[PDB]
Amino acid sequence: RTTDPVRMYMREMGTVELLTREGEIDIAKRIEDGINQVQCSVAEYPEAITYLLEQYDRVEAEEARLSDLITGFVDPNAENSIDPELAREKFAELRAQYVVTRDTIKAKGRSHATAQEEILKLSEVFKQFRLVPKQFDYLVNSMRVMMDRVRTQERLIMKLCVEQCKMPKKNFITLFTGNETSDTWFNAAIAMNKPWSEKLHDVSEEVHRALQKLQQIEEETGLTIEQVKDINRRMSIGEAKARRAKKEMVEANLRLVISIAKKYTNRGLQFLDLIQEGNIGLMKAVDKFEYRRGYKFSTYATWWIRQAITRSIADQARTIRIPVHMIETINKLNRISRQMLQEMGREPTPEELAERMLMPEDKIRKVLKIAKEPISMETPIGDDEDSHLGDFIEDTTLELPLDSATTESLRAATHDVLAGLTAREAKVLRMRFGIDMNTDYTLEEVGKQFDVTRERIRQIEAKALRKLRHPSRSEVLRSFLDD
Amino acid sequence: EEFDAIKIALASPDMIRSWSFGEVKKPETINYRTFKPERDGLFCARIFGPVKDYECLCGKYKRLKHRGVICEKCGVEVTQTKVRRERMGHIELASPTAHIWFLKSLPSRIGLLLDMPLRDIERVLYFESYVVIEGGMTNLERQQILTEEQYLDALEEFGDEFDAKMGAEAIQALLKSMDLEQECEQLREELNETNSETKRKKLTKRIKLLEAFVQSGNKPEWMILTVLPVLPPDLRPLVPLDGGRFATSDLNDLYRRVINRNNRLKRLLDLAAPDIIVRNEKRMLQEAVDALLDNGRRGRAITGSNKRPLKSLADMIKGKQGRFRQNLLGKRVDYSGRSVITVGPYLRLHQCGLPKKMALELFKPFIYGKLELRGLATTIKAAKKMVEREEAVVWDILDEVIREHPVLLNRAPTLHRLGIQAFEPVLIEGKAIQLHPLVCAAYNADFDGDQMAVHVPLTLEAQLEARALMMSTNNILSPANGEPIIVPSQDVVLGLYYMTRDCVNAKGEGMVLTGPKEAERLYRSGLASLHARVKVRITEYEKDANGELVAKTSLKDTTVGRAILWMIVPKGLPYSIVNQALGKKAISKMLNTCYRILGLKPTVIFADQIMYTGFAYAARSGASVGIDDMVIPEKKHEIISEAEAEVAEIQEQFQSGLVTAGERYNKVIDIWAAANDRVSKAMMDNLQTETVINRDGQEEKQVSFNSIYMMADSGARGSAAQIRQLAGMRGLMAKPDGSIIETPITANFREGLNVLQYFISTHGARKGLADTALKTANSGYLTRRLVDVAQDLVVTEDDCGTHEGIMMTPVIEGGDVKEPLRDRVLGRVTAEDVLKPGTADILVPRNTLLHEQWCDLLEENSVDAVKVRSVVSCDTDFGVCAHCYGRDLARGHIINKGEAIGVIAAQSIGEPGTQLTMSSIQVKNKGSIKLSNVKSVVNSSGKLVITSRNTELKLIDEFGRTKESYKVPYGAVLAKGDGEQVAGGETVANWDPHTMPVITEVSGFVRFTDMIDGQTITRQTDELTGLSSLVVLDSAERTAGGKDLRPALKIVDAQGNDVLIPGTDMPAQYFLPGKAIVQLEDGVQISSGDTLARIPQGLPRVADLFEARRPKEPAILAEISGIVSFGKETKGKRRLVITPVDGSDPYEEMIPKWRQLNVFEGERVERGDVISDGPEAPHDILRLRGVHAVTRYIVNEVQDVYRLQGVKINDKHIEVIVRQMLRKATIVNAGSSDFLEGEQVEYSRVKIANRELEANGKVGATYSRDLLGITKASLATESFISAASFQETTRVLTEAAVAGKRDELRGLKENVIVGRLIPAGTGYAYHQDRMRRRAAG
Ligand SMILES: [Mg+2]
Ligand SMILES: [Zn+2]
Ligand SMILES: [Zn+2]
């Protein structure tokens, strides 16, 4: 009755084993080949072939770049510090292939051997450019989404046509999907005969109205219909190729993952967290790898997953997040602490250690304000289980009732004082400080409200201080002087 | 604020959407340096609320220019704060994981419903095996598991037409599938097809869950979690310290945990993984979820570097630790204090020592209002300044406050209502609290390091409640008993004893007085003895007239102390009570007479003066005690040497090999204990009456001069035992084994121990001290459960108009009176008109207050039994009439409505139990004899022998009310009869205490028949004499050829007939079991009453008694009247062919005939007749008998357990809880509701008080009556909150929520914790006003 999923998962992964040294590179081959045939699929789609020089002129049209996107782009590998000379070189042949391509795809259409061998070398000059990152996903999404439109169209049309006519479907299968543009399929079905074909009403408008949106996607796309269903299938296969291929390899090296794991299982955190994460960094390490480098893949994914885990522990693993500059500084400290302790034989001072670490005690101490973690309210600082620490604290945030009474007595005595004043005086002195109000009216507006005056207000103010200050009304304050 | 009632329900997901203010999105909370709430983390003010007044974080919007202007940069509010304790955020989940309380706990509530095993579902939900969501084809079946590899078979076979997955997705769907109604009618239907027991209850169970979800509208899919709340920070906070050091709660971890996992869930789910990792991840997730609800439930708990578990959400509600027992029902308090304590000997009742600073700081705002009023301190700053300035006026002002301002006195452990009190303040220049010492007797307190706490009645209501209710003048007795609780404890008693004292010795003998004033003058002149019988005159008074004193006067020869003492006395009494040495029992009853006759205040003030004068004349009396007051006799060494040369006798006897150890052991301890007794007697005769002092004569002897005896005689302290220990040997000693030591003690503390004697003294001392260190836990535990039961109960009504209840008869049995029926009755009220032995002399019209005039009027009468309207026979729904209760004792009159009761018995019963754990029949005197329920016979002696076991003996007096009572065995032998008279001291009965007689009442021949050697029996002819009979073996030893054949030697005549039972055609022969060996052979004859054969041979108790605890070993009984034969031949147990007269025979049950039977294989019983031997269970009694018998049994049992220890409580208390155990009765018939189900017998009585009324002749159902264990009786409650407070809480809460239930706050516990007023007593009137408001809309 083992509920521990440790046992479960380790059993379930012990299921699988590893293979080596050519099934590995066979999977690489399979992957890259299916990818090259999705690349072929890209080099198809005539007016969408040319999503190379368009976006390439795009990244070029800002007069010079080597930055993020071009560091994504071509990046050809060698069985570069980008020199823009070759960039400028490669905006001349591409346009040439374009113009000579748009000339021939209309000459009789698309069945002409030299034309499609020119499209083959077009696909080749396309294929000298690697299947570089994000930008082409879009370009595939461009082709991915439109698929999900014709898949829309058909699925609509079927429901309208199939559910009715009289006979179930099969003639519809063989008829509509071929023609789908004129009503000649109808007369082709009626090639057989019958008296029940002579009656057709009440759906004639719906068929060609539904059709009316069909050709609209042609201008959206600019292609035949057959080649669509060709390239959909072709590319999907070139994808699924690699999509499968690695799950052999992913499941292959798992024992290595754990093996290198229990290097860094230095008790700071929990298993499945770290396990999951190592699998994750491994996902990349698989996604990225070059066998032609000819090395052991262990080394590759070791680098990758080391990084992944080394940063994920630092991100997580505390109550407070602590960015990494602190972290690396802290690890330096932890190592040279021990080094300098061997040197000294003793604890080092911030003095000579600031010297050796080559920077002042400022940062030392600035760090040492950080080095602590929290200590969990509910601990028993009551040794007998009598008072856990949380029970000691008072909240010194709200207020004290005696002081509320104090300030209320203040406010009421000021009401009493101000009650003995001239109307203009106390109204000025109220609204000008927002006493009694949510407001605090001030200088200019009064002129713009009352009339003008500003300075004689000040003069009034001082004389009011005169008549009130004289220690006859100043005593309801004189103990709030002590406030 | 005000609201009517509460409710539980199932929170929809959109309910939480409604509750929530924003969704949470990260694990972070703050910066490292700018200790700041981060957005979208934990403490994001944007969703939970702001710190300060009108300050967005970047300060963009400010000072009400931009009032309701969320600062768009930081997205932060502006408006007012204090919602970081209110607002709960939320989180939307990726996928559904389940709640656990509706899964893991007993009966599972979820798969419980689904009629599926748990482990199956585990295999689904540990993601191990797929399972049929739905068999698209019925080729396969819903609720059918497919392993993930056999699933492949099912799959590649078909692929399409099945639904089978592995997860809550598979399951919510199932819930989302399944339709309730059809299932419900189906179970209802096919129950009636086969409604066998387990089947039927299971069908009922599922129908209940069904119709519950129907009519609730609560829903099955709501078990499972797709959105999750998040709490306000202030319940889960994080703060710093003065050191810059930070401190957090557990839960902020766990919230944090899940975030990242859900992040790593969704993060992965961007990335198209194998399912295996997803399974693993989901496991991590729902594991964290469990950990939230319970760290350590499903498995190995979870810790930080603490190495200790993280506290559950649940743990906040739990044990004591949660809100209930720590923070809600017990509370810290403002305006209270404490201090060390001491005595005020001078003081009076209402007074109390008070170190003044205490009241000073505690009465501050009185003084500040008062100084503003005087305007010396015009306002309060200066008031406190002047306070620091220490002006005399303050103190006057302080006194000027303190007058008439009562106050509360508090000691713990508080075991009953009297352990705290309410006094009036008195100020003092010390830091030790002086008080009226006697009430230590109430508090069980002593001035040896005790200390106490104090509280204030600020409000006038409290002020006056104090002055009126727990004013001590309003509280002088127990409610347990009519006992004066202010017994003069230790010294006053003794000084008074010494005073009222009749030497002959001192001087001034035989003179005469006018009155005690000159007695003072005369002794005080130094002429006289305060202890000397001499003549004086008195003038005593009596209220013989209409409560109207009737004066008179005459002389007495009395001691001088007593004359003096009369001066205190308030003029309504004789001299006879004061006519003696006045042991403290006399004081008890004396003060008793005072309030019996005058009432309170005379007795009060009288007692105060008695305390005073006791101090006075005891401090005069002169006293000390020393080495020579401790005295040893001389006749000790010789008894010692004598028995010493006899222990050596039996020593040499064992050396020769004669006696055993146990013989030797018992007899040696007998002689040593006898020597102890002789030593005690010697010193008693040598110290009690030894002194030879002459006085106008040769020699004279009277009350001792040792100084020790009258310490015990006063009752102040001590008794013969302790004094024996000081003087003589102090009994024997034991190692904690429980064994008994052989060589006793010789020395005492006057002489001095051996090494070994003290070494040994160690042991039982340690033992019993350990016991003393632990019986309080069980005590508090039990008493706590007792209050936990009976919180509901309060009087409601004057008279329930009910029909009769209990009968009262004294409990005298086996000795003299143990409870006078007088004492039973007093303050009760009759069930019934009640006449006298003078017939038809009714004096109650079914109910009078049975005060002591009535009781005397009785005790005249020879009446010996009477009925009383019982608390049980009361029928008030949800409370009682005061009549079925009668009187409040320490009131001393009829109970008024409104005061709650169950608590009262609880304090009565729990408090004392702390102290509590630590042949022949011979007539005594003459008297009438009363035996009945009798079959017996003139035996072959001519005397009397029982032939119906029912009967037992009594010695009835010549009158008719009993003297003695003793059990009498079936067929034991007598020397007497019933309806006769006999001399005292006369062995009337005898029997072999080994034999259970097989006596033949018949007279008929013996012939060996039905029985053959070594088939049913053995033949074992006695080697010595020669006579024997066919010798019956036990169940096992006989041979199996006739072991199924009941052996029975048969009674015949000269012809061979069956000598039928005299009076009935039933044959008479004995299917003889083991040990029924007969001695005389074939052809022989027996007599009437002739044995053919013979048959040769505390605290946890009561804990079980009230618990509804139940034995294993019943002296099993007759289910139904009529004849019986025995049954199947022992496939583990024999069975029992019962046969009613007119009923139905077939009932028969497994019997271990290994243990002895009462009735035999051809012998008849009436119902209610024991069949085996042993203890028995209560449920058997209810199930068969009436009630009065039952309750009467148990009360007798446990009252004896008390009284054993010399313990005194009225029976009324114990009646009470009975009706609280009885809150449920199981149904018999049907037609109203479900068939049998236990339900409120109250509400049963309601519905039949509507429905079986001409609503219907009958639609509804008759009903059984039931019983419950006490804790689960507490659980079985309409409310859940009292049920939820303390034990098995989680489960109750779940069960409460599933039906979306609610409560109405009628039990007091319910209305406490909300801060409302009590539904009783003081708030009775208010809350009934509110009641009629609820009645009036
Ligand atoms: Mg004490
Ligand atoms: Zn701001
Ligand atoms: Zn009643």
Side-chain angles (χ1 to χ4, degrees), chain A residues 69-103:
Chain A
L69 188 65
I70 294 161
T71 63
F73 293 176
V74 188
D75 193 358
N77 295 119
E79 279 181 348
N80 187 8
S81 66
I82 302 301
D83 297 332
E85 173 56 27
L86 184 59
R88 300 296 191 278
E89 182 63 26
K90 298 281 93 179
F91 290 87
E93 80 288 13
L94 299 177
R95 194 178 297 276
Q97 301 289 324
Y98 173 72
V99 298
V100 68
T101 303
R102 293 289 182 269
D103 296 334

Side-chain angles (χ1 to χ4, degrees), chain B residues 224-241:
Chain B
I224 313 305
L225 287 298
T226 62
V227 180
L228 203 150
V230 182
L231 284 167
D234 286 329
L235 280 295
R236 59 187 180 80
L238 192 149
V239 300
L241 290 174

Side-chain angles (χ1 to χ4, degrees), chain B residues 399-418:
Chain B
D399 177 77
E400 190 60 25
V401 170
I402 288 159
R403 186 167 62 260
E404 299 296 334
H405 198 71
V407 63
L408 293 169
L409 284 303
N410 201 166
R411 183 170 179 263
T414 295
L415 306 181
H416 59 296
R417 68 183 175 173
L418 314 176

Side-chain angles (χ1 to χ4, degrees), chain A residues 175-236:
Chain A
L175 288 164
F176 173 75
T177 302
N179 198 167
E180 65 177 0
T181 55
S182 179
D183 292 329
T184 62
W185 63 270
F186 180 76
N187 291 319
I190 301 305
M192 59 193 87
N193 274 118
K194 266 172 183 174
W196 68 265
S197 168
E198 286 180 353
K199 65 101 177 180
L200 188 146
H201 297 90
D202 84 9
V203 74
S204 299
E205 191 273 331
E206 296 293 328
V207 173
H208 65 81
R209 184 178 58 79
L211 192 145
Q212 183 58 250
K213 176 59 172 67
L214 186 148
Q215 66 267 18
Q216 176 175 357
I217 301 173
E218 302 175 354
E219 293 84 3
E220 184 60 26
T221 58
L223 197 151
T224 64
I225 305 94
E226 183 60 26
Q227 294 172 0
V228 177
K229 298 175 187 177
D230 189 0
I231 305 155
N232 296 127
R233 304 293 188 284
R234 189 175 296 276
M235 177 271 295
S236 299

Side-chain angles (χ1 to χ4, degrees), chain B residues 715-784:
Chain B
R717 296 288 293 164
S719 66
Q722 292 174 356
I723 307 307
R724 188 179 294 162
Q725 304 194 351
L726 274 81
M729 68 188 83
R730 59 184 295 162
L732 279 75
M733 186 62 203
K735 192 168 185 292
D737 190 0
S739 298
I740 294 164
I741 296 170
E742 289 76 2
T743 303
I745 299 302
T746 62
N748 60 357
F749 293 149
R750 187 172 177 278
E751 293 174 355
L753 288 169
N754 192 12
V755 174
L756 283 65
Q757 296 171 357
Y758 186 79
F759 183 90
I760 297 154
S761 173
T762 307
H763 290 82
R766 181 170 293 182
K767 183 184 187 176
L769 181 57
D771 287 327
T772 302
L774 192 285
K775 300 291 182 179
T776 58
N778 297 311
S779 183
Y781 184 78
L782 176 56
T783 308
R784 191 270 189 199

Side-chain angles (χ1 to χ4, degrees), chain A residues 340-341 343-344 346-358 361:
Chain A
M340 295 292 290
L341 192 151
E343 298 191 0
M344 294 293 287
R346 295 185 286 101
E347 65 90 21
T349 67
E351 182 271 330
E352 61 89 16
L353 185 62
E355 177 268 325
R356 178 72 287 289
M357 297 295 289
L358 194 59
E361 293 181 352

